[PDB]
């Protein structure tokens, strides 16, 4: 029985995880107190993917909460679903990292990593057949990035055969909230490229653009961003929980999407999104979902796919629909946009179909792309990195905690090598 251990780090990861546990909990029908009050018989069939079973017919999510500032933990406990989590999994300390990756990875997090790994081992030992992990955190921050990278390294050291997923929120061109985001982002990306099987890219700029242009909201908050992201996470792993005409495990996505080991940075997307005003106009059907999934403005990474090529894509549909229509639409998308797909991967579109849609919708779809345009994002960070590293803008904070220029240099070189490895396949006309 496949099931997932869940880890949350930092403020962004903690909040996204809280919202995610509210969404999954609806689909499966779980009371905030922990009891089950569903209506369908298929909600409890595979509930063990996320939830352990307690004595009194309760269900406890298999989540791990990590931070160095206690305050966020309180915000989780004093909330709509604060009592659902078991208190033993609230692992935290004091004197947070303060947006310093060195404190998160080397000085402060090195003490709390033992306790976090203890709780992770305790959860993973009880697993019937542990599939893999998934971590939510922010690369541009402090405790989140550092402790996420450290935990990822330790877990890959101890569990080499299991899947290691990751949902990362990285910096943006215009949206910036810390002065030292490039250093943290560069070091985090250097750590992630080695020790991770899948990494979904999320950008606040793309989510705000979706909210303003697609959903037409006027005053979006972080709740809406968490809503979209949690919808994506629930969309990714639908097939482990519910039956379908053609299933798609996590390993199937990993195999079909990753041509070479270092190219595992994905662009996610979700459909439909209708703004609550145009819901009565559009007809809902497979062609509409196909059109919305591949639209450039619907992506969550703020990287235009038209500036590169799609190495691979995966489409996970939820709902009762015909397979012939899905296959025809995917073939049409391949054929019409002939110049945005690579010429040495015939039929580079993975397809999955699940028969149980979300509770309020007749149809839905999730899109996981893998394209060269992601290089742009890395290039941007690299540019900013140089602009601070050449003069050593803030390096004394990092070197005071037990680092040196050599780690910065090797991280920058690794990032540049990854950026070069994407471009290779980016240009057309492989001959000269």
């Amino acid at each position: 029985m496949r099931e997932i251990v869940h880890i949350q780090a930092g403020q962004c990861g903690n909040q996204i995880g809280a919202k995610f546990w509210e969404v999954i909990s609806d689909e499966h029908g779980i009371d905030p107190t922990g009891s089950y009050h569903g209506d369908s018989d298929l909600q409890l069939e595979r509930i063990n993917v996320y939830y352990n079973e307690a004595t009194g017919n309760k269900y406890v999510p298999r989540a791990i909460l990590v931070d160095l500032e206690p305050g966020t933990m309180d915000s989780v406990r004093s909330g709509p679903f604060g009592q659902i989590f078991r208190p033993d999994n609230f692992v935290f300390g004091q004197s947070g990292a303060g947006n310093n990756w060195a404190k998160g990875h080397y000085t402060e997090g090195a003490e709390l990593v033992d306790s976090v790994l203890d709780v992770v081992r305790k959860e993973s030992e009880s697993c019937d057949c542990l599939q893999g992990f998934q971590l939510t955190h922010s690369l541009g921050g402090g405790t989140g990035s550092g402790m996420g990278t450290l935990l990822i390294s330790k877990i890959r050291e101890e569990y080499p055969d299991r899947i290691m997923n990751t949902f990362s929120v990285m910096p943006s061109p215009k949206v910036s909230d810390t002065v030292v985001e490039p250093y943290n982002a560069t070091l985090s990306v250097h750590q992630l490229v080695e020790n991770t099987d899948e990494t979904y890219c999320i950008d606040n700029e793309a989510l705000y653009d979706i909210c303003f242009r697609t959903l037409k909201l006027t005053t979006p908050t972080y709740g809406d961003l968490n809503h979209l992201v949690s919808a994506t996470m629930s969309g990714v792993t639908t097939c482990l929980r519910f039956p379908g005409q053609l299933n798609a495990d996590l390993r199937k996505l990993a195999v079909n999407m990753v041509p070479f080991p270092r190219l595992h940075f994905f662009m996610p997307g979700f459909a439909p999104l209708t703004s609550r005003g145009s819901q009565q106009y559009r007809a809902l059907t497979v062609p509409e979902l196909t059109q919305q999934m591949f639209d450039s403005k619907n992506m969550m990474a703020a990287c235009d796919p038209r500036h590169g090529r799609y190495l691979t894509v995966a489409a996970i549909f939820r709902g009762r629909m015909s397979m012939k229509e899905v296959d025809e639409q995917m073939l049409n998308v391949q054929n019409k946009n002939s110049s945005y797909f690579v010429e040495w991967i015939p039929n580079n579109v993975k397809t999955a179909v699940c028969d149980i849609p979300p509770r309020g919708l007749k149809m839905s779809a999730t899109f996981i792309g893998n394209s060269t345009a992601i290089q742009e994002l890395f290039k941007r960070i690299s540019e900013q990195f140089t602009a601070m590293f050449r003069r050593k803008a803030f390096l004394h904070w990092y070197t005071g905690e037990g680092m040196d220029e050599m780690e910065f240099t090797e991280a920058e070189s690794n990032m540049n090598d990854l950026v070069s490895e994407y471009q290779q396949y980016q240009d057309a006309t492989a001959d000269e």
Binding site: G98, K174, V175
Partner: protein
Amino acid sequence: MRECISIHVGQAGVQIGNACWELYCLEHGIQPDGQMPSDKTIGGGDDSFNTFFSETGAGKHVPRAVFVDLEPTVIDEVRTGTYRQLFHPEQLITGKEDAANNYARGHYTIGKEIIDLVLDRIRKLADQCTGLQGFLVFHSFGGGTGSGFTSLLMERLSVDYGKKSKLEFSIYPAPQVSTAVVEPYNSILTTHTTLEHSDCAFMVDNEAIYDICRRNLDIERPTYTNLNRLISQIVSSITASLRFDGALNVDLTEFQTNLVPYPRIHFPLATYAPVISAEKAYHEQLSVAEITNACFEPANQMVKCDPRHGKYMACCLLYRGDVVPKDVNAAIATIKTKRSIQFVDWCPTGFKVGINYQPPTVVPGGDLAKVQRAVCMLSNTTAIAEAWARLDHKFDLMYAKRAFVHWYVGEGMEEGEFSEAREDMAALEKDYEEVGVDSVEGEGEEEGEEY
């Protein structure tokens, strides 16, 4: 428990402390006698926030404050005032003469025999504290006590505690206005301690605050009470991130991680945007864009220096009240397109943002209008060099003839602590000039290998 210990030195320090503690008592619903009837009316809570106040068994709340001065007058005004029962009876006041606008008198002769008691009480306060974040030292350049005793206390604290942050709020001498003939000497002699030992020093000017009061609040005849209240608002905006919940919380370490590129350039300016009278509170929207733009106006600066003559090195915005991230993002985006505001080429991000839900409070008898939104900006720039240079000139005009020097040497110093300080000022100005220069053109001179 995000505990912070406040130290007040000199008359300016004690009066700013009076304003600050009035605002703190009003913020958390603490009465002047230390009781909090809010918990009794409600039933219980965490309203006795451990940042500033320590709760005893009987429901009383003692502030984490340390008042120091050499004159009995300034603190005897507090021992028999409205807040006489709030503070602990121990107030560390030497029943003798004062430093008398003399750095030497406050550092060497009379600063002794009072430093030991002060350090003992600071240790007693620190022992009660768990997870102490740092210190907040209030004083004033140009005074004997606030220069010499502050120097001695900072030196001893750096020796003892070391790794704890030590923020500084100080009143710099104005360019034209002054209240003493020997202000430049005392101001210059404190550079060694304000540089080597402090982690971040915030400077304010009385002329700038008087201009702000005259122009914005329409107060034609302000006194020091208004200035102290404005400074109290600034400090509360700084410290609110670790007392109340918010969308993005900024601790005192994120401050130093984001604002100071190098150890020797930790002198950021500060400013408060929605400084407006009650009558003018109407006829205005007071949106995020308006206050954020007003933070960058040279007229609103709290130090007499023009940011247009320098370059912005780092910025930290701290918002309070009904604010949302997207308005702040739009404000930063429209700010980045203005050519009058120049950032150093080696800090492309250039902004740190924090948001807190608690809106600012209104002190009865005050002059600031009640508002829904507010923002405090702290900006590390290179224009501050000008604020040193003028003062440096003044120092020379008195040291060429060795005027007023016999008072200083008659208390323990020699003339070399009077040059060493000048050379340190010169080196600091050279550093500030060097950091702001644009990167040399294609900083690897030029490049381009074969292909």
